[PDB]
Design an enzyme around this catalytic site. Structure first.
Site, PDB file in Angstrom:
ATOM      1  N   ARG A 147      63.845   8.848  56.476  1.00 46.39           N
ATOM      2  CA  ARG A 147      63.804   8.655  58.275  1.00 46.39           C
ATOM      3  C   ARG A 147      63.669   7.105  58.796  1.00 46.39           C
ATOM      4  O   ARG A 147      62.448   6.960  58.152  1.00 46.39           O
ATOM      5  CB  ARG A 147      63.227   9.721  59.006  1.00 46.39           C
ATOM      6  N   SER A 168      56.322  12.371  54.080  1.00 46.11           N
ATOM      7  CA  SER A 168      56.495  13.604  54.440  1.00 46.11           C
ATOM      8  C   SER A 168      57.386  14.349  52.864  1.00 46.11           C
ATOM      9  O   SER A 168      58.371  14.804  53.097  1.00 46.11           O
ATOM     10  CB  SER A 168      57.808  13.607  55.644  1.00 46.11           C
ATOM     11  N   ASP A 173      45.261   8.111  52.415  1.00 44.41           N
ATOM     12  CA  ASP A 173      45.763   9.115  53.332  1.00 44.41           C
ATOM     13  C   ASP A 173      44.552   9.983  54.094  1.00 44.41           C
ATOM     14  O   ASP A 173      45.811  10.305  55.168  1.00 44.41           O
ATOM     15  CB  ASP A 173      46.427   9.474  52.171  1.00 44.41           C
TER      16      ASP A 173
END
Ligand SMILES: O=C(Nc1nccs1)[C@H](CC1CCCCC1)n1c(=O)[nH]c2ccc(F)cc2c1=O
Ligand SMILES: OC[C@H]1O[C@H](O)[C@H](O)[C@@H](O)[C@@H]1O
Length: 428
Positions: free
Chosen positions: A75, A137, A168
């Site tokens: 994305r 993701s 993270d």
């Protein structure tokens, strides 16, 4: 439940940690966190307590790109954060064709760069040098900056600054903070294990200033290399460590992480085999093979509904022909190892939470902890056992655990917001 076999339970009971054990571990972690935060001892500190420069008060960058990498898709998102922060977005999913994802990493990122170019054209944003941050993701299951930088250079038609990714744990904290503004801790229990949290600036001696808070990346996986866990290490842990890439290091992480969990189980089963308590004392060549018992096998064994179907199928793959009793023992071996991981992990998080409660001079602390990682998410009952243990070690704390939801990608966009603003603040 049936009456368990005494000799099996004796071996599995070695994994047990009582509350006083965990409090001992917690206090040792707290001392290492202290040593990590102090100017005088940070250099020699095993737990580094790295300043993230993610501050409680944020400087002004306008538009930026967020690039979310999925499994076989990505994305591209244009974001504008306005002041209560509004996350304004427009985005586009792209599918990666086979050639792009079967070629070199350069060819893949040439394609990604083309999509970004197309996206910028679509939104008429080619006039700006936008910062871009990465988010991930991936479907959860048991470098990209450089690649994109190089690919942008190769195109040579538009400019764009790819910013350093945050750790993270930090991404987890920020992503969860978007949903719940009391989230000031980020935890990962995956292949590795780590936590970050919002420390008082007076306690972050590596950064001058005593006002507000700054996120500190504990890198607490390195805990243990001065013997802080030695008394709790079992034969299985010693063997794991000895055959690892880094013997003597990441001992804490070696007790918790999905990297070693399956191996720990494998060694437990082999001892039970050796003592004639499992598979009638005959192990398969696959079971005597290092790494054969995958961590995903542990969660899968624990997911069994009592049917023993899941477990029998796991062990049949390993060339074993297990009886009902074999399957039950294997489950309890998995339980024993995974519960110990949850216990050890809770002592660390409890150490952080109790430190924060003391540092903020709060009688009763209300706090949200954002958590991600394959173990925490996929392992049945791990998070519940972890939760219960953390809460037991944190009186006067009301702790909410959240996992970030994809939603519309705004939590992720906020991670890129902070990453871009940090990069700006540091002069890139
Ligand atoms: O952006 C931030 N700090 C930066 N430091 C350097 C560059 S930008 C922090 C981060 C936030 C993370 C979660 C814990 C609290 C601080 N941050 C805020 O300070 N204030 C905010 C207000 C609303 C909102 F939706 C997000 C933030 C935010 O992320
Ligand atoms: O992925 C969880 C953690 O794994 C390892 O410990 C890494 O050193 C750490 O940076 C990361 O946060």
């Amino acid at each position: 439940k049936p009456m368990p076999l005494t000799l099996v339970e004796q071996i599995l009971a070695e994994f047990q940690l009582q509350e006083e054990d965990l409090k001992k571990v917690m206090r040792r972690m707290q001392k290492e966190m202290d040593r990590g935060l102090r100017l005088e001892t940070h250099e020699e500190a095993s737990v580094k307590m790295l300043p993230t420069y993610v501050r409680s008060t944020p400087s002004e960058v306008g538009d930026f790109l967020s690039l979310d990498l999925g499994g076989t898709n990505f994305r591209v998102m244009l974001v504008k954060v306005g002041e209560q922060w509004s996350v304004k977005t427009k985005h586009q999913m792209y599918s990666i064709p086979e050639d792009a994802m079967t070629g070199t990493a350069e060819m893949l990122f040439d394609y990604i760069s083309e999509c970004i170019s197309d996206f910028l054209d679509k939104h008429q944003m080619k006039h700006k040098k936008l910062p871009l941050g990465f988010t991930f993701s991936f479907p959860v299951r048991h470098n990209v900056v450089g690649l994109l930088r190089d690919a942008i250079k190769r195109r040579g038609d538009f400019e764009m600054d790819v910013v350093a990714m945050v750790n993270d744990t930090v991404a987890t904290m920020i992503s969860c903070y978007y949903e719940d503004h009391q989230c000031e801790v980020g935890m990962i229990v995956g292949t590795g294990c780590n936590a970050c949290y919002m420390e008082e600036m007076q306690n972050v001696e590596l950064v001058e200033g005593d006002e507000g808070r700054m996120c500190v990346n504990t890198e607490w996986g390195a805990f243990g290399d001065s013997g802080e866990l030695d008394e709790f290490l079992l034969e299985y842990d010693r063997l794991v460590d000895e055959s690892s890439a880094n013997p003597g290091q990441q001992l804490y992480e070696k007790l918790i992480g999905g990297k070693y969990m399956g191996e720990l189980v494998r060694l437990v089963l082999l001892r039970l085999v050796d003592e004639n308590l499992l598979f009638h004392g005959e192990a398969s060549e696959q079971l005597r093979t290092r790494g054969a018992f995958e961590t995903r096998f542990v969660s899968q064994v624990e997911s069994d509904t009592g049917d023993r179907k899941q477990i029998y199928n796991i062990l049949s793959t390993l060339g074993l022909r297990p009886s009902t009793t074999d399957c039950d023992i294997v489950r309890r071996a998995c339980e024993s190892v995974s519960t110990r991981a949850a216990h050890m992990c809770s002592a660390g998080l409890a150490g952080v939470i109790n430190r924060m409660r003391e540092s903020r001079s709060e009688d009763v602390m209300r706090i949200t902890v954002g958590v991600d990682g394959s173990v925490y998410k996929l392992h049945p009952s791990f998070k519940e056992r972890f939760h219960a243990s953390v809460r037991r070690l944190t009186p006067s704390c009301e702790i909410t655990f959240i996992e970030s939801e994809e939603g519309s990608g705004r939590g992720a966009a906020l991670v890129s917001a902070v990453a871009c603003k940090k990069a700006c603040m540091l002069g890139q």
